[PDB]
């Protein structure tokens, strides 16, 4: 759970670059696939188990 974003999956270092106001990203078909850690400000991918 990332400040409201509830989900399940494996967290890994990403290679995306958000804009300096965006918290999380979605893929095509509108499903969350990356988030930013509120504390460390790093982008992490979310892959299904």
């Amino acid at each position: 759970n990332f400040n409201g974003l509830t989900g399940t999956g494996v967290l890994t270092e990403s290679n995306k670059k958000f804009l300096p106001f965006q918290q999380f990203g979605r893929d095509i078909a509108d499903t969350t696939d990356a988030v930013r850690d509120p504390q460390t400000l790093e982008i992490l991918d979310i892959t299904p188990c």
Binding site: T6, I28, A29, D30, T31
Partner: protein, 46 residues
């Protein structure tokens, strides 16, 4: 035979349509997971 390459490079619509049509149906299936269908919400955590 040397002209075939021009006719194809400038054609594979029958193969592209079947791949694209199936992908559009699969994406349409996923887009149904964000509808209420006559409920208070679409999210089980609510």
């Amino acid at each position: 035979i040397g002209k075939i390459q021009d006719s194809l490079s400038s054609a594979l619509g029958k193969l592209q349509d079947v791949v694209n049509h199936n992908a559009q149906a699969l994406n349409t299936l996923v887009k149904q997971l964000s509808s209420k269908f006559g409920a208070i919400s679409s999210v089980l955590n609510d």
